[model samples]
Target: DQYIGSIHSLCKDQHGCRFLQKQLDILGSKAADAIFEETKDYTVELMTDSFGNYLIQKLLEEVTTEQRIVLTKISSPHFVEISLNPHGCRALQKLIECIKTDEEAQIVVDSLRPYTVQLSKDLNGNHVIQKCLQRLKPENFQFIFDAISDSCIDIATHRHGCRVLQRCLDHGTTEQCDNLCDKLLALVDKLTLDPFGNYVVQYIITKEAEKNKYDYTHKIVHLLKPRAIELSIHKFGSNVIEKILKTAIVSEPMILEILNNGGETGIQSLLNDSYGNYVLQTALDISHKQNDYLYKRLSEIVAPLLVGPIRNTPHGKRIIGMLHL
Candidate 1:
């Protein structure tokens, strides 16, 4: 019977065949609805197999444009799986050419992510896929990058997308790189805290600097400095006085006026903040290393505080007891 043959072809292994036969026997006279309900979950996977690929390819050849669009929208991974098949890859290339919007191209791009790892078994094939992605227009690149940057996705996967964009830049023409850099800079501005974007910007700027693009580096550094300051301030606090004092002890004399303006109370306020011990220890470390006069000044300022009764409390005990200072 046709049912028996269909069932046989559907069940690839002996276990699957036995299971299908049992389900079929259970359905008896009402097999149609039962089979449909039972097999719905497997449809996408089943439709990607050799026979299913052949059937879909035939349908695509015979169908009108509207029907093809409908087929493309199917959430079935089979669409991509079939397209990436060695024999089917050519057909997919032709099919994608008819797609009009970056949106449609995006669908194909989204579908490619899972298969990209294995679809191309060799280096040449992988390079081809990478090239195909790179050739997408700027608009399409933005869409793909935005999707990849989405925080909801896996962090590693997002990094892979950034890597892809970097490679795209490398392969692009001079004009294309200029446009790509502009687009990337806009993205960085929009998402300032994005560590990956920050990494890319820094990477590109460093590369440019190495190539003697000092002017470009100067522009980039100026743009980046504000964001860096904002990020550091948000992570630290509004008390600029405390910040300067901490920096003064740890770092060189970059802002001597700022440190001097903070005065003794302001410096003490900073030292009293949650990270006080770490800040103090860091200052001491730098002082010990430099053997600078600031070390003597810092030791005098901290001596009385160290011998204070608050050092007897559990909170103070932890800091004082741990360091044996």
Candidate 2:
């Protein structure tokens, strides 16, 4: 009764939320529902509370036991509003996950559909869209996919939205994957150096590359090659370069040749730079896998590392370490 007497105060505290959970864990339904009645009136308020959000999920999950009556449907009317708030959107995801029927789930799909592009970019909202994508029917999933494919670059540039795009790549149908992959192609250069956007680039060249092999993956590789050195040296961009070398360059002969023949800023250049050295290490390892003996040529370039100030820095020590290994 203490936990429920000043229920808002209790649920507002993290440990107290756990205590309420303990009561439900030990006692079960009716008694538990009584504590939550006040919580229900303040559904948005409770779910939006930094600490109360989780308590709401527990209550929602617990209420499902009553076969005779559907417990609460707070999300039904406020789907979009809740979907836009970080805490609310997360609880909204649980609500969708717990829905009793496809009809019940569709109400959310319909509500979220119109906001797909907007929310896919929203830090909190994208999570809900992703949940809907996973939980909703495939046909209904199209609404979300269409919005993602259309404004993909816009979404891909943001931290949260990039994840949504990656999931689309990870989860979409072949045609669906190709459609978005094609959209991302146009924005490749612009996003390659973006702190958040570069991940999409990595996914495009490697993750997406592995899926289709040459179709969409090849273009990203081809396009990235021109700026291989540029991307290989940037803090975020370097990772994409290593991805292409490990997957794209190693697998595709033409890609391998393009990077190898790259002049002034080619393979040897990567072998010599600060950031590019990481990709260089992966390349040598790859070369070793195929018995390519490129390392024999690289041996001379690395032999001088310990002789000078090149042995003094972190990047230099990394080179020295690889050389000895």
Candidate 3:
């Protein structure tokens, strides 16, 4: 009774929230209900409050199913605002984590559906989307995938958005992975060159490599093979190129593109490049035993480059060391 009528004010205080969360933790359901009764009207405000958000998360955990639904209803209109708030993002994730049925999950999904793209790109908001991935069934969150499909390239290039796309790959089914793969593959050229998007491309290749889905790998390597050297010398594209060299089964043509097309001139330029040098090293390591022809050409091409002023550069020194064998 000492806490009567003062629940809203207490919930927003630093020390006050901790005491209430403790009550919800130890006092069990009915007693926690007293706190919820007084505080339920403030659900949306509390969810975005720095101190109050934790209390709402605790109540969502202890509150009855009906009350949980009511809380969801109250906060549904403010889903985007809450998702964008650092504290509220954590609270909304907890609410997502507490979803008891598909109906409940759909309500949460529907509330955030229109803003899926907007939320996926936000620093704080993206976590809420990822949590939906973590907690809800694939079907329940397919709306998120649908919402972001057309914006795939833009999202993949975004720092936070890239992560959300990867999470879909990580948690989505093979069909889900493949579906997103199909969309992402179309933009492979742009994504491979982007600072943030390169990671999503690598992730798709790495995942495909693990699953023996070389068809996708072949398609990527094929698309990128044409520009193997161009991509190899790029600051970010080179990383994706190296991932292909390290993982793709059909990398022989890719190696020849660099070694045979550019010949010694290309080899010298790549050997001298800051980013291209790493791709060449990976090319050496990956093709070491598979093709004597590649090894001979790589060694022959690189061997001569190592003898001149090129050998004195930092990039050249590493290739020289790798070639020391």
* Superior candidate under lDDT, 1 versus 2: 2
- Per residue, candidate 1 scores C-alpha lDDT tens digits across 1-325 of 3354355354465455455545544444445343444443444444444443333333344444554465556633554555445534543543454555566667767776555544333322333344545565555544333433333123212444445555554554455566556656555453334544444554555556446454344444445433332332322322221233333232434122213533454345434555444445554555545555655565555555655765765445554433323
Whole-model lDDT per candidate: 0.45, 0.68, 0.83
| lDDT tens digits by residue: candidate 2, 1-325 | 3433676668767798777777677765576567656666777777677767787777777775342124335545666677778788877788767776766765666767777887877778888888876766666577778887777777888878888888777667777777777788898888888888888877766674465466756777677776666677677788876676677344434235434564434655565677777866665555555444555555444564445665676766666555544
lDDT-superior candidate, 2 or 3: 3
Q: What ranges in model 2 sit over 4 Å off?
A: 1-20, 27-40, 65-73, 84-86, 205-214, 248-260, 264-272, 297-308, 320-325
The true-structure Cα RMSD of candidate 1 reads 13.4
Which candidate do you rate higher for lDDT, 1 or 3? Answer: 3
For model 2, what is the C-alpha lDDT against the true structure?
0.68
TM-score against truth, every candidate:
0.34, 0.78, 0.93
Better by TM-score, candidate 3 or 2: 3
RMSD of each: 13.4, 4.1, 2.1
Angstrom error of the Cα, residue 226, model 2: value is: 4.0
Worst 10-residue lDDT window for candidate 1 reads 233-242
